[PDB]
Amino acid sequence: PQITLWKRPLVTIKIGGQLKEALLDTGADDTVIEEMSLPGRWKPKMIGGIGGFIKVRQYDQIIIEICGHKAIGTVLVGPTPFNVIGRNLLTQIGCTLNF
Amino acid sequence: PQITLWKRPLVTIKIGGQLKEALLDTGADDTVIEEMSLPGRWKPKMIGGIGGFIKVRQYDQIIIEICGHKAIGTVLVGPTPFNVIGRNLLTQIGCTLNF
Numbered sequence: 643p644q645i646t647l648w649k650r651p652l653v654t655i656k657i658g659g660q661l662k663e664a665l666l667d668t669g670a671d672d673t674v675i676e677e678m679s680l681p682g683r684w685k686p687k688m689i690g691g692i693g694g695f696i697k698v699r700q701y702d703q704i705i706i707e708i709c710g711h712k713a714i715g716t717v718l719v720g721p722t723p724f725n726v727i728g729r730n731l732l733t734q735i736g737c738t739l740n741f
Numbered sequence: 742p743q744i745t746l747w748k749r750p751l752v753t754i755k756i757g758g759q760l761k762e763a764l765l766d767t768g769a770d771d772t773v774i775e776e777m778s779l780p781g782r783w784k785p786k787m788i789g790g791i792g793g794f795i796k797v798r799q800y801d802q803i804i805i806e807i808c809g810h811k812a813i814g815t816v817l818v819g820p821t822p823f824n825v826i827g828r829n830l831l832t833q834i835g836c837t838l839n840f
């Protein structure tokens with residue numbers, strides 16, 4: 643599809659059997675989701691942006707459904723103010739910036 | 742043009758006659774740039790990022806060029822990990838997300 647940027651590009655995603663609203667974010671290297679339960683092992687990580695850093699849990703090979711597109715990748719879980727779909731997953735659904 | 746997201750969407754911008762590197766950021770509502778000198782009066786502005794809210798200086802109607810595309814709008818100046826070109830300017834250059 644073609645999403646204009648007049649407003650926040652929010653989309654519904656399916657992850658860990660749950661449905662959530664997430665921001666299609668080209669500025670994010672990683673995909674960060676609010677506290678939730680995920681299968682598999684994990685390791686600590688610190689990520690930083692505007693406002694500083696937060697500690698999150700890195701889970702790998704996590705499947706996510708985005709607007710009908712199934713993508714697999716690393717997902718960081720932690721106290722993020724907003725759920726963001728990063729480049730590691732945007733590439734998998736073939737998302738690009740155009741102008 | 743069409744920009745893929747395998748690597749950070751870093752582009753060259755021009756503000757105040759100087760060239761700088763910035764990130765095309767669909768997850769940012771505003772354009773935030775590192776400390777620099779801009780003309781005119783500024784207003785206070787609080788923006789919320791991954792690590793919390795921070796105070797920045799808001800300058801309006803600032804002339805800025807993004808990858809050759811001219812734009813004139815609000816630019817926020819403050820402590821940021823990258824100079825980020827947010828939605829307020831991405832829309833001015835007709836940038837959209839596609840997949």
Ligand SMILES: Cc1c(O)cccc1C(=O)N[C@@H](Cc1ccccc1)[C@H](O)C(=O)N1CSC(C)(C)[C@H]1C(=O)NC(C)(C)C
Binds near residue numbers: 668692790
């Ligand atoms: C700058 C800004 C505004 O002026 C207004 C609203 C949100 C943001 C903002 O920081 N947006 C963020 C995403 C976000 C929104 C709400 C809560 C948390 C995060 C972003 O587009 C991004 O990926 N950024 C901005 S700074 C960055 C380039 C390092 C990168 C980043 O934080 N990346 C990680 C999430 C991977 C840390």
